[PDB]
């Protein structure tokens, strides 16, 4: 009950997840590059 | 048994989390997409595009040989 | 560079959208941690 | 009361110092046969024409080998998959020249280890145990059968079996990489994850238990004397171990259940070795690892190499040099 | 660099006349090469007889020389020996014998032109084209 | 209450992810390492150091991407971003392979931070620090392989590259150039790793098959409580089973678990000693007696001599593309090859 | 029936064990699963038809189902050339539609039908411990298996024939007229050694022996079906076996593991039931094809192919098998037991004949040998053909390789499943599958070993 939103665990989760999704979108764009 | 943070299953089943992450995760995805598809990643990391592995004046591997002056070496390599 | 703005503006949109959807409770938590 | 029932009671007896059982009636003769012939051949067997090209390879200690280089050399390529027992040779010297001891040792050994697996079930049944230790032992058995039986069957020659020696094993591995790219085979990758992870989990489990032992000794004597064989109580604090490991990573990455943890310990290297045994068993039929040679081309069509291409150059070197007088034709098809 | 016009510019006959394939014709010839030729002519070798490879020196040394598009198109209609003496129409895949070579029976004249063009362009993209079997 | 004790209170708070004092070393450095790997394999080429594509941006897959080692012309230069090679240019730093010493040094310090975390949590929980002592094996392997081996060689170029097929290349390289299979230090490592996998499998299966019936379900996993005092499986039955099957058995659970620690850690340490030997080309390459006999008698052949021929062929065929900075021009006629291949 | 752990004692990850004593839901599981098998048969056939280029050889095209139909004699002519695409399409459509029927029936029995069939009918309701009913079900299913083998016989003898690769004039669909009813040949195949030159039942080299075996199998399975309907298990069988549902499952698992291994070896070695016109060459076939191709090529250049020694002193092209037969040289000496319709015309009583090699080699034998040596079952996991050191331009892995690898792996994992279910059946019947009872632990009453 009345948990904090932003924690050390929040920063931990986003430090990895946010560039993870950035990189996954980048590699998905890479799949359509032609020779 | 719980360190005090909100449990993950209570978070990812909440309406507010999905209102926010229904925009934030597609925006990060298409930001990475635009990093690649605009060609910005090539100039940022120095990675050759498929037409710049070899030039008209160089048909060999551009293996670095200078100890220090590698900026001039790579420019020459083009 | 138009490429840098084109890439960075989804990040600004994501930060903005999360800020409108969380900012009242984030202000509340910041007041709770003084 | 009958003689046969008395023999059945002795064979299946839990009071025997080494359990025999009905699987043991097959395992003991076969393993003793293969052990005797292996020791004699490793010490004293004459050179074996393994490749069938009249170029005999010396494998035994008395013919100039050491412990590292010594081997019981596989049977001749001229034999192939043909059954070559002692009585089908015109003399013992011909049987020795053609690699008959390899067929004798391998066939008895393989029967012996399958009966060892069955004997593990059998003793678990006679002791009132759960029966699945033999399922775990099926993974080294599958790997041994893959390299001694299944790969020769797929390649059409026992000459392609793993030699019974240390440097012969290395020769087998290197030629296998040259011909199959086993490193780039996802099932060997699971094998490696199996053995690397199995050693990791062996060290973590052993370290966590030793870290959390209940104080029962002094620091003069060894801590192992704090355990009595047959004691009812647990000798370490699983809650302390869990409270350590769930702070080392996070709480729900840590086993609080000892049965769940021990299952995971059993299952991970067994599954990994099952996968790599199937990798070798499928590369027997030349379903090889990943080929990414010239996968990347520039816009003109010039090859841009990767690490797979450099690995392929290494594979070429091995291949064009192996069994260097055996090939008469442009392709190594088997 | 790009797949330039000069890279796709190859001799057409023995009189110095040249031709320039398009990118579409190059890709169609490469596809026909992968689908039909590579089982024996992977990387320009010849797995069944590597004395007669698809390398440029070997194509130049044929009688008459096969380093132009018209001679290659004539070879794929009537294959001969390397000295042009023995009839090889029952021993080499060709468009003139569909009854024994059904895989080539749907390839048009422009398909043969494209695969001949790709056979002429591919050695200048690869230094190992037409070498030994293990190389 | 002084500021140090207040900071120690905050760093050692019970939270989903424990930080501690060691986290100040562990969490940035590891994030520098792993992200530095993930950046490189996604974006960064090895075209100017190796003549190779090694990123997803160039079309390589997960098996073929790497953060490849730097160019051999730099020697053992640490290749700082501000250093005399890149001179603060980020793009040039990426192109010359500066991401390799970035990931290797941040990884080294991150591994140090992780061992310090093991010590810190072991002290705060109240247990003995044998998890950290066990983790010395992986640190010995990392330090010997990724640091000491290229430091003994000409440059950072001959260090393993942080990729799947790059590691495979390093593996085959040490075969053909060092005969690393013939090295007893490696053979002890193989014994330790396969023995640790054996011990993991056999101990897990033995426990799961000598379980006490402490519940009614066929699901035996819920018949265990973490606060229970009794053993969940029969040590006596397990000992009798393995004594009759195998000849010997564990009778002491503490020795069992210490052995489960001891075998793969000793294997890692012994293989590290061998890698330190290979750093100076101090190889177990040859048996000189068998070489002299084979040189004087052309009928003598063993598997060892066959492996020597295999290494010779791999060296000659691999060196021009693997060491492109050396400009090895080996014509086709000098390459060793058998008949018809 | 319980659908949770508290009421069954089985977790979710072992849920289908909640059906052991629920015969109606068990039947629905069994019948829905059959749906799935017939669904894959039909949908995979339609996929293979849709991707088929019929002038191109089936084995170039990743097909494992159209070769099975073509071997039965449908849609093919001489040399396995595709006459019509419609029989393959028909086989696909009929399986796909029927699979819909089987899936609807499994869902019924599984979700709506009675959970136990024993209170509804004595004929269909079974107890696992009822040895008469278990053997009755064996018997019904044996009569059906014998009818299936006789249906293969009827297709070969009465309804158009099967593809014979060994047929004179070239391989063709032919009607089998004189099947081998001689039990000496049929069961001497069972008596032959599982080694080189003998090959057990993998060495069946003619369609007459295959069709005669299926007449005998049909007769044997029908007779064994009636036996098991009319009889009950005897005392030695009752005292030797475990009588439980898991036990019967494990017996079937060991049986399936054995047939998976046999199928992998069959498709790897046998070119009669698996004709090389559809499946491509075997590995032995391709190696002998390479040796023959270069024998022909060097003979055309004027080499004396019989008097040519190689570097080792053995004959470069021709040499002697260990029993003396004149065979091809190099490493293919291993494959001198290989027999094929392109090669057997050049064989004499002593082996390969010099006169036939000099003046009887036809151009089609050269074409077939070149095609088979370049379609050797060597390939990468991403389907790059040839040796693994080759570059990426040949998209080919042999159907023999795919089928053999698959069935070997399946066979191994079904042996593992046999060990798991047999061991568990033994422990559950003996009463200690859930663990050692602490009070009556058997080791605590045994004497010490030393
Ligand atoms: C333990 C566990 C705890 C974990 C710790 C993790 C922490 C990691 C952080 C440590 C990183 C240290 C990097 C050291 C870089 C280096 O070494 O860089 C090397 C330099 C020397 O540079 C080299 O020097 C060589 C010799 O040069 C000399 O000779 C040349 C030819 O004759 C020329 O004449 C040249 O001018 C002349 O200087 C070549 O030039 C090489 O190209 C050049 O790179 O030494 C130096 O900086 C310093 C030399 C002295 C310090 C050595 C300490 C490191 C130990 C190394 C062991 C070496 C070999 C044994 C291997 C086994
Ligand atoms: C309980 C059982 C206990 C029984 C134990 C008895 C031993 C069984 C294993 C046999 C050992 C095989 C060794 C050599 C195999 C071989 O030469 O080859 C295999 C033989 C096939 O023989 C081949 O059969 C061929 C027949 O083809 C011939 O005829 C054909 C007709 O079309 C073609 O014309 C062809 O060209 C022509 O050559 C040839 O004769 C070959 O020379 C001949 O070698 O398979 C066979 O006979 C039968 C299949 C063999 C076993 C199947 C695999 C079993 C693997 C289990 C692994 C388990 C792992 C679990 C671990 C835990
Ligand atoms: C071949 C696959 C297969 C089959 C046929 C079955 C069949 C069955 N399972 Mg098992 N199961 C399987 C795989 C399978 N399972 C796997 C892989 C797992 C692990 C996740 C389980 C785990 C499991 C548990 C834990 C339990 C079962 C149970 C059951 C039985 C009752 C199912 C029930 O109540 O569902 C109710 C489910 C639904 C009503 C959801 C809808 C399901 C339908 C069938 C969807 C069909 C879709 C299909 C496209 C429609 C086609 C219609 C027509 C055109 C043909 C049933 C006989 C239960 C049991 O033992 O009963 C006592 C049970 O407790 N299963
Ligand atoms: C006996 C089974 C079998 C066999 C031999 C084949 C063989 C083939 N299929 Mg088919 N297929 C099958 C089942 C089978 N398939 C099934 C069940 C499906 C439905 C999912 C399909 C769907 C299918 C399609 C849609 C296509 C093929 C194609 C192909 C061809 C290329 C295969 C390829 O590239 O694989 C790549 C290799 C892999 C993906 C490796 C998979 C490894 C598995 C997962 C390992 C499993 C191990 C073990 C069982 C797991 C147990 C774990 C536990 C016990 C511990 C080849 C002829 C292609 C083709 O050319 O057709 C014209 C094609 O397009 N198949
Ligand atoms: C192995 C398969 C199998 C088995 C053993 C059963 C058994 C049973 N079913 Mg089920 N059923 C099945 C498949 C099966 N069914 C399929 C596939 C469907 C979907 C069409 C159904 C749909 C179904 C319904 C809707 C009902 C049953 C019912 C019953 C029960 C009464 C049977 C009866 O009246 O028989 C006597 C009937 C006959 C003797 C006439 C039928 C003869 C068959 C159908 C003709 C030939 C079979 C087939 C076409 C041959 C080729 C098959 C091919 C796969 C080789 C009995 C327990 C009833 C039930 O639950 O009772 C409470 C019920 O209401 N079944
Ligand atoms: C798949 C179908 C099937 C199934 C499940 C069964 C199941 C059974 N049969 Mg039946 N049987 C079948 C088909 C089948 N049979 C057919 C088709 C026939 C007609 C030929 C018979 C004729 C038959 C008779 C005459 C008898 C049985 C009996 C039995 C029972 C005991 C069998 C036993 O202990 O074997 C275990 C086998 C042995 C103990 C023999 C040991 C010999 C060694 C182990 C053979 C090893 C061979 C090796 C593993 C593989 C080599 C392959 C090949 C070269 C041989 C059991 C219920 C018995 C019974 O109780 O009657 C009611 C009985 O007397 N069956
Ligand atoms: C026809 C054969 C058959 C049948 C009917 C059964 C039936 C049963 N098994 Mg057995 N089993 C079999 C074969 C069979 N098994 C084989 C071959 C093995 C060896 C691998 C096992 C090993 C085995 C174990 C270890 C156990 C059982 C158990 C059980 C029971 C519960 C099963 C369940 O709910 O699964 C639930 C299903 C799942 C959880 C999903 C399985 C996931 C697998 C790994 C997927 C494999 C991948 C596949 C190839 C496709 C790849 C997809 C990929 C692309 C993602 C049930 C009585 C349990 C038992 O003892 O109960 C008494 C049990 O613990 N089975
Ligand atoms: C380099 C560098 C740096 C650093 C950076 C960083 C630190 C970062 C990062 C980063 C990151 C951090 C990134 C990321 C990522 C990611 C990714 C790329 C992912 C992925 C994934 C996937 C794809 C997965 C998948 C899967 C699988 C396979 C299994 C199961 C399922 C799933 C889906 C899960 C700096 C600037 C400082 C400086 C300069 C240099
Ligand atoms: C019980 C259960 C289960 C299972 C289920 C199953 C197993 C099923 C099934 C089912 C099935 C088995 C099905 C089916 C189907 C089919 C269909 C639905 C069909 C069809 C058809 C059609 C429609 C066709 C069409 C066509 C034609 C006619 C020709 C041309 C082409 C085409 C394709 C168009 C599970 C696991 C979930 C779990 C829970 C319980
Ligand atoms: C169709 C065909 C044919 C024919 C075939 C035949 C005629 C057959 C057969 C078959 C048979 C006739 C079989 C069988 C089998 C048997 C088995 C597989 C067995 C067994 C065993 C068991 C299982 C036992 C067990 C045991 C013991 C060991 C003792 C104690 C008790 C018990 C029960 C545990 C031919 C090749 C001509 C050609 C191709 C096609
Ligand atoms: C999440 C992924 C993380 C990886 C890194 C991503 C960042 C993107 C790369 C941007 C590269 C910018 O490209 C390069 O930047 C460097 C900054 O170091 C500039 O460098 C310039 O300023 C620096 C700063 O004093 C000078 O030391 C240097 O000599 C000069 O060239 C280069 O002129 C520019 O070409
Ligand atoms: O013997 Mn033993 O290694 Ca199977 O691959 Mn062909 O064989 Mn020989 O070569 Mn490469
Ligand atoms: Ca073709
Ligand atoms: Cl060799
Ligand atoms: Cl050869
Ligand atoms: Fe333990």
Q: Give the CA-based shape of chain E.
A: globular
Q: Roughly how many Å is the radius of gyration of chain E?
A: 14 Å
Query: What hetero molecules are bound to the protein chains?
Result: digalactosyl diacyl glycerol (dgdg), chlorophyll A, beta-carotene, dodecyl-beta-D-maltoside, CA-MN4-O5 cluster, calcium ion, chloride ion, fe (ii) ion
Largest sheet of chain E, described in full?
2 strands, antiparallel
Number of helices of chain E: 4
Number of helices of chain B: 4
The name CATH uses for the topology of chain B is: Single alpha-helices involved in coiled-coils or other helix-helix interfaces
Can you walk me through this structure?
The structure is cut from a larger assembly and holds seven protein chains of seven kinds. Chain C is an all-alpha fold and 34 residues long. In chain C, 91% of the residues lie in helices and 0% in strands. The termini of chain C are far apart. Chain D has 334 residues and is an all-alpha fold. Chain D is 54% helix and 2% strand. In chain D, helix 4 packs antiparallel against helix 5. The longest helix of chain E is centred in the first third of the chain and has 19 residues. Chain E is mainly α and 135 residues long. Chain E contains four helices and two strands, in the order ββαααα. Chains D and F meet through helix 4, helix 5, helix 6, helix 7 and helix 8 of D and helix 4, helix 5, helix 6, helix 7 and helix 8 of F. The structure holds digalactosyl diacyl glycerol (dgdg) (DGD) (2 copies), chlorophyll A (CLA) (5 copies), beta-carotene (3 copies), dodecyl-beta-D-maltoside, CA-MN4-O5 cluster (OEX), calcium ion and 2 more. The site of fe (ii) ion has 3 residues of chain F, from helix 7.
Could you give a quick summary of the protein structure above?
The structure is cut from a larger assembly and holds 7 protein chains of 7 kinds. Chain D has 334 residues and is mainly alpha-helical. In chain D, 54% of the residues lie in helices and 2% in strands.
Provide the descriptors you would attach to this structure in a database record.
part of a larger assembly, 7 chains, A: 35 residues, mainly alpha, 66% helix, rod-shaped, E: 135 residues, 34% helix, binds chlorophyll A, binds beta-carotene, binds dodecyl-beta-D-maltoside, photosynthesis, photosystem II
List the helices and strands and how they pair.
This is part of a larger assembly, with seven protein chains of seven kinds.
Chain B: H1 8-11, H2 15-37, H3 40-45, H4 70-77
Chain C: H1 2-32
Chain G: H1 5-8, H2 23-51, H3 66-71, H4 86-112, H5 131-157, E1 162-164, E2 172-174, H6 183-191, H7 207-230, H8 235-240, H9 245-269, H10 276-279, H11 283-300, E3 318-320, E4 326-328, E5 347-348, E6 351-352, H12 354-359, H13 363-373, E7 379-380, H14 399-430
Antiparallel strand pairs in G: 1-2, 3-4, 5-6
The complex binds digalactosyl diacyl glycerol (dgdg) (2 copies), chlorophyll A (5 copies), beta-carotene (3 copies), dodecyl-beta-D-maltoside (LMT), CA-MN4-O5 cluster, calcium ion and 2 more.
PDB class: photosynthesis
Keywords: photosynthesis, photosystem II, oxygen-evolving complex, transition metals, metalloenzyme, mutagenesis, water channel, hydrogen-bond network
Entry title: Structure of a mutated photosystem II complex reveals changes to the hydrogen-bonding network that affect proton egress during O-O bond formation
